[model samples]
Target: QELEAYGISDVHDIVYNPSYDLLYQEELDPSLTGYERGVLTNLGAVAVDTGIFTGQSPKDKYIVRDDTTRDTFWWADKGKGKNDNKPLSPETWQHLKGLVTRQLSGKRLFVVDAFCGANPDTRLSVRFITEVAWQAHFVKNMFIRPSDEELAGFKPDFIVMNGAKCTNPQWKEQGLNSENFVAFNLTERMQLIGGTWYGGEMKKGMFSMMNYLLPLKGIASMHCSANVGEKGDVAVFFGLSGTGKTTLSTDPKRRLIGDDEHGWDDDGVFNFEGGCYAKTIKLSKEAEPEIYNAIRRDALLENVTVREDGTIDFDDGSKTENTRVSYPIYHIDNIVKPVSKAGHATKVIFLTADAFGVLPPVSRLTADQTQYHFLSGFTAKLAGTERGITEPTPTFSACFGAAFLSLHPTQYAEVLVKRMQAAGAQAYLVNTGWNGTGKRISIKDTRAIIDAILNGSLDNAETFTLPMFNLAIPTELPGVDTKILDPRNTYASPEQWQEKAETLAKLFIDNFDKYTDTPAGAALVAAGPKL
Candidate 1:
């Protein structure tokens, strides 16, 4: 009868708010009553495969173009925008929701109720319904878990229904991009998913909603990770996938605030999630002990290779290099307790995996340059990180998360700039990718550089200007090699570095043309590189 109220009929059984132990048993232990698609690893964590899509299917994602979104929402034409937001009519959305409801019928369904933001004042209540047990557990890990007291009065602000096994046979007639679809209806606060079980779709679907809702309320929603020093100094790290936001922010010396999504309000920053989703590819205990040890019981591993003895093979990329592990925030020993929030950020870092390899390891960005780069969001898409990406390719993702934005890129950038200037936050660009000869930067040196930034070791350091990009390079640091300060030293010759840097400069200039209509865009253009 409850399922019938939601338009889902003929449901055999409904499980609501299953506990951790129950979820583990449903996923890892066999039961004659329920279906299972998960196995146990030696570490006591559950492992499962996200069929068809190992990563997010961005091209298939859409937002309903209703009266609410008609004026404010950004739209992309189908077949023209790659990994951009496509439009879905209200009529199509209703038809799709009906299909999802019918597809979810005649089966055992799992329901999870959680909150999206850590701050109560700005938080959104979410209810998830899916057929996958492990995915129910996944949301329980990723989102803030409400107590029995809270659940007693629970009412969802948004509803999400997952029909992973359902496909759009009439996609062409429905005007959709493909057979698989993930569409969100903002006015109704409803979302429908079909034909993919990547799990990231669920997580990012919530993020896209937050990205739309928060920015309109005068808060700066960010695609970044945060950590706080012992002195209460907050630092925000912005980057795309494979760019070390999770790795760099999980420092033993500092307490992690959150690993992925956050919001910046007038007073400070608060995490939008309750967990950390870190990549397990080539993950080592020596390099990232916190992340490595956090992957134990109650955590969920996706698409990672498992041995016959149940030992995990982190280096094995036969399935995908985007092997992932999701665990609650408290899984780490050190973190802000009870609440995941901090005072205004004192330092802001923009990370980019520069595939072209001509950028410095670390460079200070002037205020104007910071705005320019924040808008540019230059980075390389690592293989398997997203759909159809088999190798590293340079691309510009506005605000570092164009795939999830509901408004223009400048909306987020302007808010970030305002908060940064008000708090006097120092901004720097860090290259976590590679050198000219394809050698990756040492994580040790990157840590040392971050330590200097946090400990004020770089306060009085002398600096010089790099020619092509006009980035300020520090002469020396206490723990880093002076040779690595200049990216040209990593290349075969100065001429090689010059050529690559100039080519990258032109790419930045050309990409900025789309945003040049605004005054802020006109001023920041001069902040970019010259030929």
Candidate 2:
């Protein structure tokens, strides 16, 4: 019998490589216990023969193990070595690798290992490695330092890499060094890499890989995704930063596959990232307990400064107040990361914190209107406070993903328009801000609006058409009186809201004026004032 006969392929495969060792006579004895076997197997598979140090170690690590008794996932680490926070030795890595390879053996498998570096002295390097290890452990066809040219030439079935840090000189240099190249900025580069590796063409290096992957799966990867309830009711939330997309979509009653990135395949919508990154500058444990509790030792905190006792000091803006915290949704008790696919979206909710007060709350859009707004990506800016503004500012983000999108706005907008037309998804804009004169809406009022959206009460409101804006505004939802159209009804006075709204609207129009040269910019400017 040969190795190939037994379905064994390359023995020197990187997936099978063991990088460390463990020591413990009992730990080495496989027959002693399953834990012992697990430790020994991982080490042996990786060919590591080093001894495990039995002292207090500064670093903490965990492993994934299947418990037959409970038939559930369990964590194994130092104190709970036999149970929790288990070590991922070479043997363990190999065993896991075997499982993955077996599952994806005949299928195309691509692995992208970005931010690879052994040096732990540098903080930035450490952060990069953490992200790399997280992605590498799961992906196939891993690439370490492959140049862009090498990447372009090599075909892959799948690729998993980070998108947030491609701005680094090393990454940009390597990408530019490639012989067959596609011009891309930092955000575009990350998105394109993920798309191309995940079985999509680079195109002009503009569109998302999802754009290509969805159509192949017998479904269109619309700019938006659907979260179908068991009863077949589907709700979709779309918006850019500071909008209520994350806040609303992650409702307790809804089963959230993901908050941000998603794919619409024949199997329905599926989220890409396994976690959530919520805004936390003014985060309150009571307001968002899920995000609050997720800020633990295991969570990754970017630009957030933690005290010696591991508590977050929200007031500390010196370390970059724009905090980027990540945590697996499963870590939060209330989160819903659905494993099942294909949710039919019954309702499509568009979130915009309307600083301009010009747009009404809870408006429905015709197919064309939906297409127009999808391209427009309208939202109000809570400037000086959220993205650094002392007042409200109106803003627009095309496809509700301007910051992360790689393609021309029109490219993504066209796809979204097609998908919405196909799915017959309803569109409604919910202003989670002031109603009259465009003042800032109270948190309580915002919560009320969210509740109305989830309960479907907003659908019955008296519809007012905004032909110029390309939307249908709702008169009222439960708890909020439509008569309070003036910000004065909701806030101290409508004048205050009006002042903020006008300022924000002017800012938005001005910003749009600057981008007029681009497709998105031109479309937006054509829609309204030239600033």
Candidate 3:
């Protein structure tokens, strides 16, 4: 094609054409000859034929059409004769792949297909295609040419693919060339991938990629945060969102390795991605300076906005639906993205933003309990989009990761169990949400929780369980007040906290109801400590 003659200079400006399906805009830029079109067309046909199709309607299949067509097609059902087409253009895929690849390069790539046959939903298919395109772009950008010997020695750690009726399992089986292949039929796929894995199909792929790449890089990656203290001690902070994960983990006294999404490799724990995707809605500079500063230029704003000069316009709620901001770790001054691997973790802290006001500030978990909670990865209720509403929403994400994974929950759970057991790691559950006996903690209380975690006093106290709940709770740290649950700490009134906490608890119970008959539902109830 003549377009290839432009080298890399014209690569970015080329427009996608629907006439010939190809990943890049130049591949179908019309400057090519009939022979080129034939070649490209054949490749596209091969890709579509190789791809597994699924969707609700016949027209909903996830098929990549030419750039100009702006319509991708997929087979929603088997009985529906010919393949159905939708407006999924190659350009969209190309753009999406570029964005995700730029964000996810150097990290492992995980791909999964749920509902692999029958009728694939558009949303699911779109998500899958977006991820795949992103991975492909990432490989093309960062894949180093390996010697024959290197390629021969390379073996992937894990591969999980699933299919159902009319859904070909062959596409999934192809990934087995990497090693660690896990495949199953529809029934088994649903039981394992959907039931046990926190993220279902999408998350399974992402986490697998993270697990595979992070260890090889030799950086200490704990599914938690690591801070190197001035005295050379490393304190690990572990928690789900809204817990003290970002709050307490990025201590001023220590150099921060990362806040969330880390892996524990042989050399130690290392960060998988160069960026951080922090949840920002009620964000404050004083409260979260590190996160606040990270939201600058070079950061990918998912639902955020920028001013005329390109500065972050925090007040612009235009993109503030739960505000997802992605930025490189270098943006944060305290962040440590090390090329060298980390050693065995000194401390492992598990965080829980318990809205119930019943859990302890800090408590240790037995090896078994740690494994259970690690797999459970529970969190308090999510706040609804509406304002001035407080209610509990019980939710659990395996490995505290819901956005990435490619295997069944049990499959990933088994890996976590093995890793934690072999590492001789210590587990501590720290409640950064509510505190005090009858009062609900305020935002100020979060500071106290942070203080207790940063200092070593939390480690010396005897392990004890909290009242009204089965969680292990720790006593107060030296400088922090253990008796005050209110952020203001003025009154013992916990009515607001109680209301919110109850709402969250009820939400959890309600969510459980939806899956009560399923294995996951039964597992959630049976595995957790009584609230």
Candidate 4:
């Protein structure tokens, strides 16, 4: 009984389904858009330009291999399955979901029916058919919007059939591999998008089905980015895209939640997206001014590069720096929304951008090194934001989403180390990189060392033990600069930061023997990064 206390006087208590007309882009008429209806720019943004898949393909993502998930996640090809889970047979996902539901049956579709976990009983409902009105205005600006009596009885525990300009030309004669197909069908709860239009695959195809059904209900889905603080204390942050969980959890002393997917049940830490895609290339407004004042005109900019008269060239990447925008999450003016719907996390940080800065701009972790970097889901994309990354990138994207993990990165690192071991959380590893001082150690001193780690004044501060990759660092940071906390004291050659910290700790034990076929993941390779 909580659609905010069942308004519209409970049509005798809900869960009814008769969808398709929930249009919110003003009773439709925006599609003569045979392709590219973008170009408004400046505050009231628009810009989009996917043409030729601008971001996220991950070797054409597919996973059905049923008999219940070919062993729940890691349908391997090695290290976050380099083949990107190449498997697809539930009789080829029931003959490609009946040929993309008969090439998206009748047209003029555009329904929405949102909500994908902001915790109202593990929120799900997700109906999003698309004939395009900007993919129903980018899923009503990335999910979570119910009212008008919860969209008059919306019923869709999951469905996304977005024939995004349909095309499964028998996807390589079904056993797929480009005719552009992004498949997923857990017992027919459908997700059949096709041949790319890059609407961030309609919310990462339900965040890989909520990182595979919220750890079998123990919950801790998280691709990560959350916030709370101000005595309510909560913080989550894991990272990936240009590492900075939407710029260090958009903190102005913290409030925002829902930056890039989240969830952590047993009452607390919600937001599995209500909007905030954010990564406007080299965005500015005095550097991140809360995602440059959370764009505007109900933002939705991806693949940006506006011109002629408009404006934003946010470091114009010809047509890709994985530029993006999305918006809504109360457009950040210190967003709150998390009515205790439970709050266990006390702290759990993990952002990394270590472009060879050799780790340590912050460190302190050990529950076996936060399950060894949460299954070593390290981050580094480099080259003009993804699509063949490199400039020395080592993003094994596992728990940080190996192109959306549908379970197994030790099933979301054993439900995030059993919910930070039943809430006695406190872990960190932030490095928002390039900080070996050839600059970048100053976003007001990384917010006074994350405001002395969420105000507990760096809990037992004084630390110093970097035996190669053992990490402890901190020797004084009430606003940092205890000599950049021993990155070998801003290396002027402490043996070149110990030979690039022993070649980045042997590239984390050679990116950890590709999890030698995943079983207790070989004690997570003795929690790697050793020298």
Best by lDDT: 1
Q: Which candidate has the top score in TM-score? A: 1
Computed on alpha carbons, the lDDT of every model, listed in order, comes to 0.87, 0.43, 0.41, 0.71
lDDT of 1 by residue, 164-186 (tens): 88888889998777999999999
Q: Write the per-residue lDDT of candidate 4 for residues 367-410, one digit (tens) a residue.
A: 77777776667765344445654365567666666778766576
Error in Å for residue 61 of model 4: 19
TM-score of each: 0.96, 0.56, 0.54, 0.32
Please list all clashing residue pairs in model 1, or write none if there are none.
none
Q: Evaluate residue 95 in candidate 2 and report its C-alpha lDDT on the 0 to 100 scale.
A: 35
TM-score of 3: 0.54
Worst 10 residues of 2 by lDDT: 121-130
Candidate 3 residues 165-284, lDDT tens each?
A: 112223233321111111211211111121111112333233334443333333222456666665545556766656666657655656776555555544455543334556666567
Error at 188, model 4, angstroms? 5.2
Kindly give the stretch of ten consecutive residues in candidate 1 with the minimal lDDT sum: 28-37
- lDDT against true structure, model 3: 0.41
Better of 3 and 4 by lDDT: 4
List clashing residue pairs in candidate 4: 180-195, 267-342, 267-343, 268-342, 268-343
Model 4 clash tally? Answer: 5
